[PDB]
Amino acid sequence: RYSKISDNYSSLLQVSEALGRAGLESSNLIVGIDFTKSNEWTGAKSFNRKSLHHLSNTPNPYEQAITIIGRTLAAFDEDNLIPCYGFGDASTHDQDVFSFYPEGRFCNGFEEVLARYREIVPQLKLAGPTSFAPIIEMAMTVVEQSSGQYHVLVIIADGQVTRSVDTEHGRLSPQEQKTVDAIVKASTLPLSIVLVGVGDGPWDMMQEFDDNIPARAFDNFQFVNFTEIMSKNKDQSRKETEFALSALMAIPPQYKATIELNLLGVRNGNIPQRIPLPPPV
Ligand SMILES: [Mg+2]
Ligand code: NA
């Protein structure tokens, strides 16, 4: 499906213009980066046995994903300010996020996101386990504080939410329970959630994850497998557009939904204010 579309897009500019014609207007970007220790070994097949956070003169999957999503959504960003958070390191585990800059200062453009990412990475202690509840809750807080302006949260992660040891008897882990609850609660806000999977995974349980999310007023969640798309044997510029479209083509209908539901521009009033920890640097 997305492959059939992207075959006719030669640049990210074309993808951006398409999102514009599909109804996307002023749109804000929030980025959450997975800093769990698993990043050390999930690059086995996908990244030459290097850490997914390994820095060099070639961008790692995080930098690549940021660049592609950043370039595509930049035209819709009126203030060009991108709240950025890390999670899954030793300072946050599955309980918190930390802001890329002290006092929660937003990054100025995706270029600064990239630069500041490279500054922070070598000073982190990677940990775990994996939950997306703190980063989704942080996004909720930002949306509410902005008085209900539309946001797209892009989570870039190298694993699914941590499962229960007793998952085979139908039990959810706290990480799963709180993450699913956050996804549902987020649908009461003008917020779209995109989970970008990098590394080896496994990612084969995501469609079933998606299928089991409880009923929401609109479908506010998308998973996209960066690795699978960028591993294809086809043109590089064409892999980029396919990724951008796969990650973002559902955003304009979601945006339209936040308008039809009258979520846009209003404060919900039931959003706990999550505080981001300082960057542990
Ligand atoms: Mg991980
Ligand atoms: Na913005």
Side-chain angles (χ1 to χ4, degrees), residues 34-42 62 127-130 157-160 203:
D34 177 327
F35 288 119
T36 59
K37 197 159 187 304
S38 68
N39 280 286
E40 287 184 358
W41 59 83
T42 53
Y62 287 90
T130 302
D158 83 318
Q160 322 182 81
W203 294 114

Side-chain angles (χ1 to χ4, degrees), residues 197-225:
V198 291
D200 289 348
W203 294 114
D204 63 286
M205 286 169 184
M206 290 311 297
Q207 219 44 39
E208 189 75 24
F209 181 85
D210 188 88
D211 281 335
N212 290 326
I213 301 169
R216 292 152 287 162
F218 71 108
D219 188 351
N220 64 335
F221 179 86
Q222 288 186 100
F223 170 74
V224 57
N225 192 329

Side-chain angles (χ1 to χ4, degrees), residues 27-29 76-83 151:
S27 190
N28 301 275
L29 172 60
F76 305 93
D77 202 344
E78 293 193 315
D79 64 11
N80 202 32
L81 302 170
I82 302 177
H151 287 70

Side-chain angles (χ1 to χ4, degrees), residues 60-279:
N60 65 38
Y62 287 90
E63 297 172 296
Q64 298 183 49
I66 294 158
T67 300
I68 293 162
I69 306 291
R71 296 183 110 103
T72 303
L73 291 177
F76 305 93
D77 202 344
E78 293 193 315
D79 64 11
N80 202 32
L81 302 170
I82 302 177
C84 302
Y85 309 92
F87 60 92
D89 72 301
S91 82
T92 53
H93 305 280
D94 63 335
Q95 293 298 318
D96 288 296
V97 301
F98 70 80
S99 173
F100 269 28
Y101 289 112
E103 309 182 350
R105 171 165 54 96
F106 300 172
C107 292
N108 188 12
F110 78 86
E111 298 95 344
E112 190 169 77
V113 180
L114 292 165
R116 183 53 178 171
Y117 163 85
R118 290 181 69 87
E119 290 180 19
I120 285 178
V121 159
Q123 314 182 53
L124 301 178
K125 283 178 289 184
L126 313 182
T130 302
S131 178
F132 303 131
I135 183 61
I136 294 169
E137 285 170 21
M138 186 70 245
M140 285 193 256
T141 287
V142 172
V143 171
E144 180 86 337
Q145 286 173 343
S146 74
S147 176
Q149 298 180 63
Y150 179 69
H151 287 70
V152 182
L153 162 67
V154 179
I155 310 174
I156 309 175
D158 83 318
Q160 322 182 81
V161 187
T162 299
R163 287 188 311 178
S164 173
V165 180
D166 210 14
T167 177
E168 67 272 20
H169 293 109
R171 272 97 179 245
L172 277 66
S173 64
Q175 294 79 17
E176 283 170 327
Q177 179 65 51
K178 291 172 188 170
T179 297
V180 166
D181 281 345
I183 295 175
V184 181
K185 185 175 182 49
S187 69
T188 67
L189 292 171
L191 174 61
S192 283
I193 306 167
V194 180
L195 178 60
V196 175
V198 291
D200 289 348
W203 294 114
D204 63 286
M205 286 169 184
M206 290 311 297
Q207 219 44 39
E208 189 75 24
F209 181 85
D210 188 88
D211 281 335
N212 290 326
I213 301 169
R216 292 152 287 162
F218 71 108
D219 188 351
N220 64 335
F221 179 86
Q222 288 186 100
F223 170 74
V224 57
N225 192 329
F226 174 89
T227 302
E228 215 171 53
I229 291 174
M230 300 302 306
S231 78
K232 287 182 178 178
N233 285 112
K234 63 205 273 186
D235 204 349
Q236 232 277 331
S237 77
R238 282 215 301 225
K239 290 149 121 113
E240 287 184 348
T241 56
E242 179 181 350
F243 173 61
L245 279 161
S246 301
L248 301 171
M249 192 191 145
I251 290 304
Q254 288 178 16
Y255 172 64
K256 283 172 135 52
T258 68
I259 288 173
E260 78 176 23
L261 294 171
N262 203 38
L263 305 177
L264 190 69
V266 302
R267 290 180 198 248
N268 164 281
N270 304 306
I271 312 295
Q273 186 187 340
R274 175 166 287 273
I275 306 303
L277 303 185

